[PDB]
Amino acid sequence: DKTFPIMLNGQVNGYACVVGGRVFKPLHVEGRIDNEQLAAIKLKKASIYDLEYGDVPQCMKSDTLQYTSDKPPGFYNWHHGAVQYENNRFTVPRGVGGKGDSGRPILDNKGRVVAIVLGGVNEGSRTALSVVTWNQKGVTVKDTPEGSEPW
Amino acid sequence: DKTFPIMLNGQVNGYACVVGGRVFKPLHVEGRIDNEQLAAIKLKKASIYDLEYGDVPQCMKSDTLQYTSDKPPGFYNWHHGAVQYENNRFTVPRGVGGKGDSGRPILDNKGRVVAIVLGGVNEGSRTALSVVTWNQKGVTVKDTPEGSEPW
Amino acid sequence: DKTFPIMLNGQVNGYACVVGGRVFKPLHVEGRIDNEQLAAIKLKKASIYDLEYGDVPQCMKSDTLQYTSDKPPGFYNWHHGAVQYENNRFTVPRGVGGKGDSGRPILDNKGRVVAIVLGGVNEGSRTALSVVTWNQKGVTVKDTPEGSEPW
Amino acid sequence: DKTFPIMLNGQVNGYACVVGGRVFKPLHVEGRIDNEQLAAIKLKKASIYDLEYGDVPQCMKSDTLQYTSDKPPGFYNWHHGAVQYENNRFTVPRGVGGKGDSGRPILDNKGRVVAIVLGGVNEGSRTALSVVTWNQKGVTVKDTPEGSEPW
Amino acid sequence: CTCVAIIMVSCVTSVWLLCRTRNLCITPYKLAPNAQVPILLALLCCIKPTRA
Numbered sequence: 001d002k003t004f005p006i007m008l009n010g011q012v013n014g015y016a017c018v019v020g021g022r023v024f025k026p027l028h029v030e031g032r033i034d035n036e037q038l039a040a041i042k043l044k045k046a047s048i049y050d051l052e053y054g055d056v057p058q059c060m061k062s063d064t065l066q067y068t069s070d071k072p073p074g075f076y077n078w079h080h081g082a083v084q085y086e087n088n089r090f091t092v093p094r095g096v097g098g099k100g101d102s103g104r105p106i107l108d109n110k111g112r113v114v115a116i117v118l119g120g121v122n123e124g125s126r127t128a129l130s131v132v133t134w135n136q137k138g139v140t141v142k143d144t145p146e147g148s149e150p151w
Numbered sequence: 152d153k154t155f156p157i158m159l160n161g162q163v164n165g166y167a168c169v170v171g172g173r174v175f176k177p178l179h180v181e182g183r184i185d186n187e188q189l190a191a192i193k194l195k196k197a198s199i200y201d202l203e204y205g206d207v208p209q210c211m212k213s214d215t216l217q218y219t220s221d222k223p224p225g226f227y228n229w230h231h232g233a234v235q236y237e238n239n240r241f242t243v244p245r246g247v248g249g250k251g252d253s254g255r256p257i258l259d260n261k262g263r264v265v266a267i268v269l270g271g272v273n274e275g276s277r278t279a280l281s282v283v284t285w286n287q288k289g290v291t292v293k294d295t296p297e298g299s300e301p302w
Numbered sequence: 303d304k305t306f307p308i309m310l311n312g313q314v315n316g317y318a319c320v321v322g323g324r325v326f327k328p329l330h331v332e333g334r335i336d337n338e339q340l341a342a343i344k345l346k347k348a349s350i351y352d353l354e355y356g357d358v359p360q361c362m363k364s365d366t367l368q369y370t371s372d373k374p375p376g377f378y379n380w381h382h383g384a385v386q387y388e389n390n391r392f393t394v395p396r397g398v399g400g401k402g403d404s405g406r407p408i409l410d411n412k413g414r415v416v417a418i419v420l421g422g423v424n425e426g427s428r429t430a431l432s433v434v435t436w437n438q439k440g441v442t443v444k445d446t447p448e449g450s451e452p453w
Numbered sequence: 454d455k456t457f458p459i460m461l462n463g464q465v466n467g468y469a470c471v472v473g474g475r476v477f478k479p480l481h482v483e484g485r486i487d488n489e490q491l492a493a494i495k496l497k498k499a500s501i502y503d504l505e506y507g508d509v510p511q512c513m514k515s516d517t518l519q520y521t522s523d524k525p526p527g528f529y530n531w532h533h534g535a536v537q538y539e540n541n542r543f544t545v546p547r548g549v550g551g552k553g554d555s556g557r558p559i560l561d562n563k564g565r566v567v568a569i570v571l572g573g574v575n576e577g578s579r580t581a582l583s584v585v586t587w588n589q590k591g592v593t594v595k596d597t598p599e600g601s602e603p604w
Numbered sequence: 605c606t607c608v609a610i611i612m613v614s615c616v617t618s619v620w621l622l623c624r625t626r627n628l629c630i631t632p633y634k635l636a637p638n639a640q641v642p643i644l645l646a647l648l649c650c651i652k653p654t655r656a
Contacts, residue, residue: 322637323637324635348627348631349628349631351631351632351635352635353631353634353635368636368638370638436636436639439639439640440636440638440639440640441632441633441636441639442632442635442636
């Protein structure tokens with residue numbers, strides 16, 4: 001796919017994902033995006049929605065498209081497995097979800113991104129995911145389980 | 152031939168050929184040479200010919216000889232076609248000559264560089280292209296046709 | 303072995319060796335190491351004993367072990383051949399001993415680095431290498447033969 | 454042919470060629486000649502043309518006939534290869550161009566000397582030779598490239 | 605005013621002589637952590653303690 005990671009001191013500590021028009025990068029990680037095209041874009045601050053300026057050039061726009069509401073419970077593919085829930089993400093078993101997994105998009109069966117993983121390293125028996133979500137009518141919210149350490 | 156192309160925001164915008172005596176780079180197009188050995192060449196402005204100063208070391212110079220004046224009106228191998236004229240420029244099949252791919256040298260059957268293209272995007276059914284040339288005794292003259300367009 | 307070279311203007315003019323815990327680099331060469339993790343290290347200048355800083359994190363330490371005391375004068379390993387002297391360095395043939403070959407380690411039969419070359423371009427039919435080593439009790443010494451230009 | 458090495462302290466350091474009418478010897482080298490009958494040749498200094506006095510008698514005259522002007526750019530009988538240019542020397546490859554072999558002549562296809570080399574140790578990827586030529590009517594010309602160390 | 609300049613100059617000269625000795629106290633032993641250190645050159649003349 002198209003997901004360029006962020007490297008600080010030569011080590012991958014976070015992942016930056018591009019959605020339609022705008023690039024999204026978690027601001028609790030530090031470093032520099034390795035793409036020389038991406039590094040010429042300014043960065044503006046927000047809440048823990050983790051916004052970055054979408055000043056991408058014309059030749060690359062509309063790579064991955066977001067998913068709106070009417071989201072089923074279903075089964076959604078994930079980069080290290082699968083997640084099957086709607087209100088939150090699936091509490092994946094242990095071992096999955098180490099360090100440096102922030103900013104990974106969660107996609108649908110049609111390639112539509114429905115979430116971006118931010119926190120929730122350990123949640124007891126199975127690790128829940130602290131992601132950003134589009135709500136029942138197209139507004140972005142942020143869902144956090146209690147006691148979720150950031151990545 | 153070994154002609155390094157210019158780079159601007161990832162995509163190409165022109166070709167900077169290397170001729171013995173002085174490397175050629177159009178100042179009508181922009182960008183920076185990605186080669187580290189040619190990045191140390193001092194960028195000196197020139198006249199309306201859109202020329203870059205040839206500060207290349209002499210060992211990797213004169214690998215590409217250049218044709219002199221008094222050219223025949225016979226065949227000349229363009230990179231995507233063939234030109235057969237002496238004073239003016241012969242017609243090229245339509246479609247070639249878009250945007251951001253100028254500076255490609257026009258060679259001969261002996262491989263010597265005859266001319267360096269700068270313009271000629273679209274000029275009707277008979278495709279004429281604005282070029283620099285050597286007129287009679289080695290004088291470097293730019294010839295632009297009527298209704299010319301930069302490339 | 304892992305030995306990252308040093309780049310300056312596209313050519314290689316030196317080599318940087320890594321021992322257990324610490325990173326070595328000759329003072330006579332100028333340039334940037336190709337490892338971006340090693341560029342963030344605060345290397346400090348020192349005397350002829352060539353003290354640098356091993357500020358690398360835990361994940362890749364102890365690449366190779368430096369050779370201890372009780373040094374025999376028998377066979378030893380080398381990148382361009384073999385050396386067979388303990389008090390001095392062996393009269394290696396030509397080919398090795400040109401320019402930009404500094405910083406290459408000299409290993410033992412168990413893969414233990416004994417010395418790092420610094421000079422001794424050519425001394426006639428017999429070429430002597432100016433290296434650093436430990437004399438008797440692990441104290442770092444520097445042995446330099448007569449007429450040892452920086453190599 | 455007939456060329457004489459110059460004896461200096463037991464090793465060869467230069468070649469003293471003989472042309473019909475006047476013998477030659479490089480000024481930048483020194484030593485003793487290797488012929489008993491050339492010991493009576495009066496040694497003298499001169500300008501940058503490398504001018505010596507060929508006062509040899511008639512007993513060994515007319516060894517190598519000289520060549521006139523209008524030299525073609527074709528093949529030439531260099532002692533370690535060939536030269537295929539007229540105004541400049543041909544870019545001889547690596548290996549050739551060592552040290553201590555000055556004064557070596559360049560032969561024609563008719564067995565005529567056309568030039569005497571003087572220097573050009575190494576320039577980098579290719580090698581240029583500082584050689585003597587005859588311009589238009591037989592006037593002796595010393596031609597040098599940029600940065601030519603004597604050789 | 606001439607007196608206090610002499611004490612200030614001589615203090616920063618001797619302490620840079622002592623810092624150069626301090627830098628050369630440890631430099632023959634930092635390049636080899638596996639080599640043992642004497643107890644005379646650790647606490648009396650130099651400063652460093654036993655580590656690792």
